[PDB]
Amino acid sequence: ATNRDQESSGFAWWAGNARLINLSGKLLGAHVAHAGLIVFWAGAMTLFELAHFIPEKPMYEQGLILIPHIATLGWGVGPGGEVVDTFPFFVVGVVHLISSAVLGFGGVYHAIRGPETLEEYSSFFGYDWKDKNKMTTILGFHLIVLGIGALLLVAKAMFFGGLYDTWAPGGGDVRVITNPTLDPRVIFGYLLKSPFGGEGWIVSVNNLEDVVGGHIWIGLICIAGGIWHILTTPFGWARRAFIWSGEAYLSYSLGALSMMGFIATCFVWFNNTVYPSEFYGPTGPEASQAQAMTFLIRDQKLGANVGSAQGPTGLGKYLMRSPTGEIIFGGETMRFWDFRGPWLEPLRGPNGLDLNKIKNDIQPWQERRAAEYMTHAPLGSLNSVGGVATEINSVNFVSPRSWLATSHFVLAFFFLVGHLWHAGRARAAAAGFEKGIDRESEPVLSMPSLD
Amino acid sequence: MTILFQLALAALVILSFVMVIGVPVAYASPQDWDRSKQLIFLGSGLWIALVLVVGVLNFFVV
Amino acid sequence: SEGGRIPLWIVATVAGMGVIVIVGLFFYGAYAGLGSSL
Amino acid sequence: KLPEAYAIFDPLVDVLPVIPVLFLALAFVWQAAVGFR
């Protein structure tokens, strides 16, 4: 039982996995087995969702988070996001579940049967964390793999059926992307946009051409970077800037993942392009705007002049100006005027919402959609009672946008905490005082008094 | 075919359960490793074959 | 009669599983019969 | 719904997603067996 107790390893049972830091074979096993767990969940959860799936109910009324991911890719759906064929979901589920057996097999083998260290067995697979070049090489392999992934999304979009496009002319539908945005001014332009209101950084991406072109750029960048890191070794300045150890690299990755988690939280909360409202439900902004639309339609049918109707505060009851003058919906939803969605845009002119189009051009499908979204706002209790906090039991609903946002905020936060933990520890261990202060060499005792 | 399908799938589930318990026990057991190893090979090949059989027969029952 | 015949880890495992079963039942009951809102 | 041929496995499919959680609990059963050394 090599290194498998606190006395030999220096680590207690509750930190048992730290016993794996310099045991590359077993650690490889832990990693592969963990990947197995992930893939397992994707497959099993997909089959579970499918079994519980009623095709004529919206997805978002059914507690689905994976089927939406598949449908967004253009599998199984047609015009308006209607399910025309569930077989693709079945396929994704089964194939992930089967693959998880393979991964688990490898993981278990390397973890309890294979060579505990890889170094004496193979120069290629063996490594020293402190070997900077080997680290950059493996980093490179993995970058090339990621780049290939991004390109697989590009291939789906351009050559294998397309993607679901909520913005397609004539109504949402699956569409083939033939002209991805390649212009770097557009692509990296998103990267330089403010993350505040009306800008929203990369979260503002609002068309599939930009999504696809962006993925072309990311694919090429990742492959090029991978080659770079295979062919080079870290420069002097990097060598002097970083801590070079397993726990340090782990801490770096933990910070990166925390960042990505916060970003994904915002993406699923605000974006309705790569998270189509057909599949995920309306955004919070979307549903608020939809209420305003709904009552404008009702009152105007009754005979109200919605342009000139003055509300109790002096602001327009239905319509008002944004701080830069655009015509927007009134009431509290004044906050959400940056909202954009395919059911609303046809009423939009150069100066914002257009009163003539509002008076004459609102179609029954727009009324329907606004009613649907208004009554599927992402508000609901922990036990899945839909609606505001004071609503009575009756509707079993919590929006997938809420589930996704909340889960990923929690995960991102604890991952920031983990970054602090492992970064601070890596620093202390590299310097040699992670176990405590040397009584015979307490640094503060050699320092001058503060006063 | 439906019979052949259902039975092949039952076989896959049963075998999977057997492997799930037996593979880690064999890996960590002191004795009888040669027979164990032979059996793990056999079980793996059969597992793969069964997945393929269910996969193909799926389209003649669905 | 004397301590040790039934390993503690087995006792703990079975005890814990029992806890999981009973609490699981209590959560089931939140969705069915009295208190279910239906 | 799964395709009809697979309907008999419905109770099984209902249980699958929780299995990963069982691995975390298994680590504790294992550690208890070696005295948390």
Binding site: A1 | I21, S29 | - | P11, V15, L26, W30
Partner: peptide, 29 residues
Amino acid sequence: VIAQLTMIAMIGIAGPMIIFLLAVRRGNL
């Protein structure tokens, strides 16, 4: 409903059964 519980019983016992079997045979836990 009984089927679900049966499944999770077998599945649920699989993990502890492996530890038990290894413990009995003095395996490399």
